[PDB]
Curated annotation (Swiss-Prot), chain A:
The lineage of its organism: Bacteria, Bacillati, Actinomycetota, Actinomycetes, Kitasatosporales. It catalyses: geranylgeranyl diphosphate + H2O = cyclooctat-9-en-7-ol + diphosphate. The Asp-Asp-Xaa-Xaa-Asp/Glu(DDXXD/E) motifs is important for the catalytic activity, presumably through binding to Mg(2+). The keyword Lyase applies. Changing F134 to G/H/L/V: Produces cyclooctat-9-en-7-ol. This is Cyclooctat-9-en-7-ol synthase. Binds 3 Mg(2+) ions per subunit. Mg(2+) 2 binds at D95. It comes from Streptomyces melanosporofaciens. Catalyzes the cyclization of the linear isoprenoid intermediate geranylgeranyl diphosphate to tricycclic cyclooctat-9-en-7-ol in the cyclooctatin biosynthesis pathway. Cyclooctatin is a potent inhibitor of lysophospholipase. It is an enzyme of class 4 (lyase). One of its GO terms (molecular function) is metal ion binding. The gene is CotB2. 3,7,18-dolabellatriene produced by the Trp288Gly mutant has potential antibiotic activity against multidrug-resistant S.aureus (MRSA). Changing W273G: Produces 3,7,18-dolabellatriene. Mg(2+) 3 binds at N205, S209, E213.
Length: 280, 279
């Protein structure tokens, strides 16, 4: 099965939706050559004990999601920003690895080292715990009956699983120190930030990963909840998902201005990055 | 505003019970506290709220603690120190929540919560429990008369329950209760909040039904029944059935978790209902 017939039309409709509902176009956070080299050197050091050597061009493709999905207008701590770059990137490499090579004994101390370098004492613990929780969860749900249950029952159960599994809770808990904004920090720490953004991130990620994921027997994709071969059923399901994104976006506008800027920059930025050629 | 669910009180109570009898089956049981343990719990609660100038009777503390005695899962308890912590944290947060918010002194109260966590938990768990407590009371203070609360609570059941994962206190509950069980799977679900996300609807629908009359008379909007017109029998019946269907879907999904975790989750939801109806 495949969403290839719908690829152009769904891309057009996603963009049209963001143009109408978010308006502010994503922009890319600027890293200096020195900052990017520091980010990459930390990524390399974190994954070396795992015997992984990764090219700059691969790291640069992983990091693009942070550069595009964060909110440059509101950045206050670039040390935190670099931490998110590193943590995102090394987590991508970890997720791309044969799980039989997952050595948590080697990896978790590296994640702690990154958090301690870039964050102050309390924020380091918060970011590390979120990272630890994410990678631990992933290891638990590999072929869990729970994963099967939540991902096949209904969109609501599926997105409930994905708040953690897509990594958005981790993302918010390592990102709030970038902004140093008290309200955002609380929504990140209660996970309301993650609960508000999960659908907009997951629906876009799922659409564009569907052909690959079903080909690999992966069940964490909301489009597996419809018959994509039936154009009628697909369109109906796709419209229902667009409607979910729009409901979330309109609710997000009730948050304070900076928080809403960050949430909408994340959802729209992730879309632009996902569809980018820099990422093909 | 002047509305009420009194006409449905008996029938809905009967249908909640029938639903739990069919879908959970295992009846709630109460955790036993010795006299000494209850005295220790009550002494810690009184100490925690003394800086706020609050005097609370033993009978009041015992009424609050009943939710912990009924909603935890006695077969699987391993750490009664953690269990005492949950009794104290639950009770003192009930008192804080019952106070006129103009008397909320965080500078006095937060250190008392930390004191409690440090006494009963190990280093790491004390921090996890304290953060969850801190986040919970900080959220409550944030969402008073906030546009966000209005939006989430009036938009759809989905947006409302998304807000209540934190606001009803279940994420806090899970993050202070996992040490009671020392069960690695449960500890992770509590830490990722999947535990809270799974149990939010069953706890919230029950609490909201039995608090509706009081909450609408106080202009509080955090109640899912405000999303339907409780004066229209037909609309109410329809909405009540959809909420039962929501509880059932969650319960059936919860049975995919490992046995101990599912026992804990289902004991929480069913035990909360028993305590709510006896209260
Ligand atoms: Na951006
Ligand atoms: Na019980």
């Amino acid at each position: 099965s495949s969403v290839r017939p719908y690829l152009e039309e769904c891309t057009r409709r996603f963009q049209e939706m963001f143009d109408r509902h978010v308006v502010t176009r994503p922009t890319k956070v600027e890293l200096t050559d020195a900052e990017l080299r520091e980010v990459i050197d930390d990524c390399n050091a974190a994954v070396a004990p795992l015997g992984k050597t990764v090219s700059d061009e691969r790291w640069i493709s992983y990091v693009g999601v942070v550069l595009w999905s964060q909110s440059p207008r509101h950045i206050k701590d670039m040390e935190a920003f670099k931490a998110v770059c590193v943590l995102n990137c090394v987590t991508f490499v970890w997720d791309d690895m044969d799980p039989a090579l997952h050595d948590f004994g080697l990896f978790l101390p590296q994640l702690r080292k990154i958090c301690e370098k870039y964050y102050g004492p309390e924020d380091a613990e918060v970011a590390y715990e979120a990272a630890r929780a994410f990678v631990t969860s992933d290891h638990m749900f590999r072929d869990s009956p729970i994963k099967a249950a939540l991902c096949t029952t209904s969109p609501e159960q599926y997105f409930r699983f994905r708040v953690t599994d897509i990594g958005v809770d981790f993302w918010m808990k390592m990102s709030y120190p970038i902004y140093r904004h008290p309200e955002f920090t609380e929504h990140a720490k209660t996970s309301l930030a993650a609960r508000m953004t999960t659908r907009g991130l997951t629906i876009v990620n799922d659409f564009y990963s569907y052909d690959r994921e079903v080909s690999l027997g992966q069940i964490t994709n909301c489009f597996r909840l419809c018959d994509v071969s039936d154009e009628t059923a697909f369109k109906e399901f796709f419209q229902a998902r667009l409607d979910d994104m729009i409901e979330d976006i309109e609710c997000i506008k009730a948050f304070d201005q900076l928080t809403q800027d960050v949430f909408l920059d994340l959802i729209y930025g992730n879309f632009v990055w996902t569809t980018s050629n820099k990422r093909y």
